[PDB]
């Protein structure tokens, strides 16, 4: 009955979120700026466990290494003084015009280097202040055009870079792991490693693979019609889901970043599911945008409702599956089977076995029901609260 | 000018295209059934190289060892009769009611065990008649719900299945290589391993991945509203374009299957581009339906549109990258700076540089335009035989 | 809490739904047929207020004028002994070969002709059994190229057919209206009159248009992207809601005809708002088709889901509308001011009116905050059943 | 073999359009700001008809009345220099903080009347400058959440809105005609009036229906998967079309407003031979953005782009009707029939035509194919100029 959320649930907002002036790509900002610092205070105030940022929330990009130090000084002191972490950092190699055409996989050969230079000087930063996870989103990363982009020497220059970036951390002994974080399009119109599974792909072509994993967001993969929990899963399966950005999105079109809960909610009900019951325990990352419709006490209280959402569900789900009429549920579809090994005794066997072949009544189990709807609908009744 | 297909083009269809009798979900069969032996015998009179097959399209299901003895004699008489090789050949594990939850992933562990049976059987057929590829479309791996499968699970009995069937092919000696289908969704709500991205990080985790690689379908991978090119472009980067399904797709909608050149036409413009760049030997398969509309002759002419397509479009590419004046057009928007590394000079040397970053000039690299408008529409040019 | 519907709820269901035998594009029937007569018994049985049909449901193709006859008069001896009504009747202008390229809109005019034979014939079938709509859905009227159909002349044709079909209603002096269902795409690729929209537009060019209306379909608006509950609120804004087609969509893809609630739960909750504030008093009917990995059981429990839920939400959505606290919040929105005329004054007044614009302080009227984000989350918190 | 653009081809830009500046959700802008007297000398030299504007492209917003003077006396003395015109202008109601809910639509009355006072004046500069038609985009009508806007009551203000705009230009006997442009997103969550389908219907509903009409743009239609010739088909089959705007769009995501060719090509192709043989004779005006990757000369030349390939398009269209192979292939798949009337015999005639009905050979007609492959591939190789 109470969702009131504290530091110990690891929610953290990134400074650009509940910072958010509302200039959209019609319209003018509908909100002042914020200071980093006031919203440390007010994150802190509402529960928050942390925050995270790209350099240039932080330091104003062109800051003198002076102007810069006194930006960190007055942070870390809004971070002493509330007890807020900073879990994970990111670069901006996306809003300054030099990358128009991308950071790492930029045309220009000297804008790659100077993306590459950009990163390494923020990873530092981000070692200093105590976080764990650096993500990499490559916004710019892309193409409107056919011809623009080879996409293998593409592909070439981004492994070139991600290589890098794992040379420089294991050379300076950083405890810091990297997460790609995917999307599909926008603002490019089409993004390179567009979905979790491209970027899964890729890190495997690395030379040390282990350093690297995903930061997917249910947005992102929602803007290619995906299905957010069955992806999440296959991070995990994979060892890779090293961070996540929880928010909400309306179907295929442009990239909403709707406060967590709205949106698909069914789909924010099996995520976390999922993420509590593979015992997931990274930050529970909040990456939305409130309304341009809003003035600053809609923007807290948006914030306040991603939180409050996601402790309503993680409620449900668990007494979903802790219902004993759900768990018999699960043994009449058989979910209990498709944990137990298909062949354990071993192809030789399998071959050998006629109950797999020439014996098998192949109508007897296709008039077998999958029981899926009465589960369904168990699910349903627990998430609307109205079991019975 | 002219465009007659040739085997030497590697042109290949699957027995259920040509065959497809026009039974959709919301209407019954246009056309009456196809002999296996007649649409080999009309293919291979339109300039075909080969054919592909389902067990199922070749062999009747439930058929008795010595029927289906005498369907692949007459099947095999037909290619010899007409020089028609068959490159590649798949499973059907997806028709029969008994797949309803699915083949390699179903619920009930006893049809997992009957799947992997009903494939292997088949894999020695296709080694029989000289296939060098096994396609694998898991249709019917998915859900339309949220409980009613483990997606971790899932991915488990996926490897299981696919290490087994590596474990025998390398146990007899086969000369064939797997390749895996991906497709988002459709018979499934939302089916496992959705996109190509997904395939190759599925694959990387199999004991023997040099068996493994993948066979994209142009309008599986739009039904995502995904680049297909930049998609195949990927699967090359990595080594893994065992095979490729063509044809057309409009969008974000059911599966069309279209014939090759309808839907996205830049899309196929580009996709051939790439074909012939990177020097992909292997067949140019076509996985369409001749819409239920036509009778037997539009179905034919429906098969010769997708060669002719291909063909045009082939001459179109290979003009394009050949004019001087595109050549020219390609440096001017530093595709040629793409193709150099970022920094051979390596990580201490980057760190040193001041041009990298402290003496960059930002704002004269950002000044510079990346004339990709032109060379689009010098592409466009091509592609239309517009030019002047 | 008690969630039981009672025929005084007006639920109804299509024969073709809990009888939908499984059959796909991929996969053949998992379930046997069922007998009109037992699905009106099951139906009573489950809370059902009645049935539809196509007349194909219920006659089967070709029937001869006496087996027709027995055949109604089963079905009317199930609705004596139940007490079912029948409120709505259709055509199936799809199934049948002969309609590959449309009914009223096909390129043969003699197929054009048989189309309105057919449905006029089950129209006197409808009134003899009660039916006050009769729903009309141009599965087939469409194309998969550009060349294949001329829109404008297809519009002429689509509109001679329902002028017809008026004049034949209004000369048997039968009271009856039709209801036009949308539908983007599937079977055909491109559906004429594809949205709510289109329909709306089109019935104003009708000779008749009082005796149309729009039978829109959750699923299909959603497979073009679209906000259900806003094209609904257009179709009762004009006054043609006649009927509704409840069911559950996940996004832009096949048409999946899910149990209503499952797909967007959220857009479910608006709809059954809008339905219930607005009044409408037609019935609440469920085009879904029970998946095919259910028997029997799963599907009387998929049908008596859909009820379900929609208890379930109309209960949330008047509490949501009777809490003070969301009174006091929809004020705070200034929701009370958009029911307000904008000039009940005049345009004279209204350019004469200095605080309209000389005189408005834009700047104050830009700093004040919607409050959309707080009176979201109250409307969350009542459909999760969260409110403290 | 030329496609040269002459003012007498009636090809228009917004001044917007190349005056855009390359600031998107994510970036800053990549070029600097036009004078629109530059454009407007560019743009005549270039070939163009003439010019478009909202009200605050040529003035300032918030300019004195006599700043206003001076830029409007600035503007038409470069119309005088170049002979362009000003066929279409109209309002920005979604640039300023103040429109954040909305212009007409918005909940706060006294922004809705600050909206009207504002297109009002705009109004009269447009009939000043010889425009013919004032476009109406409600880009910021809408929601991002349900229980922000109640539609019908939304409905009620648009027409309002609409209903005194055409009071007032009635009155001051103005010869201007308005032209809704529908979108279905972006910015808002979800846009009223969504498609032209949407806008036709509404338009209906309005007090002097012969003054409104839609300006459909390709892009808008497409990011709602729907078939733009087709829509495009039913505005002129109701005698809506005022107005149009040309561009490209790669399917469903965020508004990309490519030059006029690119994105779907072949939808581009049946555009033109339906714009061109209906005889539409409205200005062929382009609302397209040059990516932010392009500096001035990129600019130009995807100006100069657009204007070619429409020309492209309309020569293989011609060709493509014009070709004596094609109206055979139209007769063969009765093209010719669908223009014929269905009944113009009379529902009595009908009812009594055995021929309709009773002896109807349904199989033979089903047995017909429609040949619609042959037809679409002469189309395809008509585009790609392949013929032979
Ligand atoms: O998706 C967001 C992106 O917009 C930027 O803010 O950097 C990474 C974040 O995750
Ligand atoms: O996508 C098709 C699938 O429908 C089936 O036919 O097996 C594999 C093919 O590639
Ligand atoms: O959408 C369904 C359609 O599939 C058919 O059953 O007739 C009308 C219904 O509403
Ligand atoms: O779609 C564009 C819109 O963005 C604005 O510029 O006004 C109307 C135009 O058509």
């Avoid at 790492?104 to 070692?127: G, Q, S």
């Avoid at 995990?236 to 999105?249: E, R, Y």
């Avoid at 409050?308 to 409620?315: G, P």
Wanted: glycine letters at 10%.
């Amino acid at each position: 009955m109470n969702y009131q959320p504290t530091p110990e649930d690891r929610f953290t907002f990134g400074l650009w979120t509940v910072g958010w002036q509302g200039r959209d790509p019609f319209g003018d900002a509908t909100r002042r700026a914020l200071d980093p610092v006031e919203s440390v205070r007010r994150l802190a105030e509402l529960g928050a466990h942390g925050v995270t940022f790209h350099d240039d929330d932080l330091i104003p990009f062109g800051s003198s290494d002076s102007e810069r130090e006194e930006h960190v000084k007055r942070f870390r002191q809004a971070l002493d003084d509330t007890g807020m972490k900073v879990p994970m950092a990111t670069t901006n190699l996306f809003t300054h015009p030099v990358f128009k055409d991308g950071g790492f996989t930029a045309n220009d050969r000297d804008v790659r280097r100077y993306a590459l230079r950009k990163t390494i000087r923020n990873i530092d930063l981000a070692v200093e202040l105590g976080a764990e996870t650096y993500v990499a989103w490559g916004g710019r990363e892309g193409a409107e055009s056919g011809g623009a982009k080879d996409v293998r020497d593409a592909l070439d220059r981004m492994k070139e870079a991600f290589d890098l970036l794992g040379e420089y951390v294991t050379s300076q002994g950083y405890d810091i792991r990297f997460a790609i974080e995917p999307k599909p399009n926008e603002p490019r119109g089409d993004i390179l490693l567009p979905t979790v599974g491209h970027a899964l792909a890729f890190i495997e072509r690395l030379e040390r693979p282990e350093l690297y994993g995903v930061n997917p967001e249910v947005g992102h993969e929602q803007m290619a019609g995906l299905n957010f929990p069955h992806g999440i899963a296959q991070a995990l399966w994979a060892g890779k889901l090293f961070h996540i950005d929880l928010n909400g999105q309306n179907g295929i079109k442009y990239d909403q970043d709707l406060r967590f809960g709205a949106g698909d909610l069914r789909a924010a009900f099996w995520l976390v599911d999922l993420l509590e019951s593979a015992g997931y325990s990274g930050p529970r990352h909040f990456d939305f945008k409130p309304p341009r419709t809003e003035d600053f006490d809609g923007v807290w209280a948006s914030a306040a409702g991603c939180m409050r959402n996601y402790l309503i569900l993680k409620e449900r789900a668990a007494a979903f599956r802790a219902d004993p009429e759900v768990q018999e549920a699960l043994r009449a579809s058989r979910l209990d089977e498709l944990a137990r090994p298909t062949a354990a005794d071993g192809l030789q066997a399998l071959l050998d076995d006629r109950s797999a072949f020439e014996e098998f009544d192949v109508d007897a189990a296709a008039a077998r029901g999958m029981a899926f709807e009465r589960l369904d609908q168990l699910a349903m009744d627990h998430l609307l609260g109205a079991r019975g």
